[PDB]
């Protein structure tokens, strides 16, 4: 069973967020992380590797040996984060993940679930972490109901969202 963490927060402060959680890391973790913009992931991956929390970014364009090369070294454990945009590259065994993190919140509920399944399908426990802010609160009703289907802890902040963005639709109708 996947432990289901939502972190309710601003554009602004993402980066300080992220910034705790990978130095919070045990040395046994292993970090898949998606960001929706490829810059940002390279921004990202450069900050953690300066750190020495070592990481390697991949998206759409990226070439079939960088992303192999990627897969060995999070096998092996020469990175600890693999940061990815729009793909998840295909050899990679799920069974060494322990963490997925969503920098950004996902475009909607059902690729949530699907990466909730990354780990629920290997039948290791794991975490799910995410990042949600105001520009997706649409989302905020539906994951609280994902959140009570999988028997997850329901954050006050997710509820403050949901219930805001109920009052300001009825305004609208």
Same mark, same amino acid.
């Given at each position: ?11 602004? +402060? ?12 045990? *040395? ?39 992303? +192999? !090369?990627? @897969?060995?070294?999070?096998?092996? &454990? ?9 793909? @998840? ?10 963490? @997925?993190?969503?920098?950004?919140? *996902? ?9 909730? &399944?990354?780990? &629920? ?7 799910? @972490?995410?990042?949600?802010?105001? !520009? ?26 949901? +219930? ?10």
């Amino acid at each position: 069973t996947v432990k289901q963490n939502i972190i309710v927060t601003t554009e602004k +402060e993402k980066r300080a967020l992220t910034q705790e959680f990978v130095e919070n890391m045990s *040395p046994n973790d292993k970090v898949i992380m998606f960001v929706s913009q490829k810059h940002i992931a390279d921004d990202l991956s450069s900050d953690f590797n300066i750190q020495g929390i070592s990481a390697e970014s991949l998206h759409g364009n990226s070439e079939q040996s960088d992303q +192999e !090369r990627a @897969v060995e070294d999070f096998k092996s &454990g020469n990175i600890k984060i693999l940061i990815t945009t729009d793909i @998840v590259s295909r050899g990679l065994d799920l069974n060494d993940v322990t963490h @997925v993190y969503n920098y950004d919140f *996902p475009r909607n509920i059902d690729v949530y679930v699907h990466r909730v &399944g990354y780990i &629920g399908r290997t039948g290791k426990t794991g975490t799910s @972490v995410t990042l949600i802010t105001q !520009r997706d609160s649409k989302m905020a009703g539906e994951l609280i109901k994902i959140l009570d289907r999988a028997n997850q802890s329901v954050p006050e902040d997710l509820v403050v969202m949901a +219930e805001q963005y109920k009052l300001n639709q009825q305004k609208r109708h």
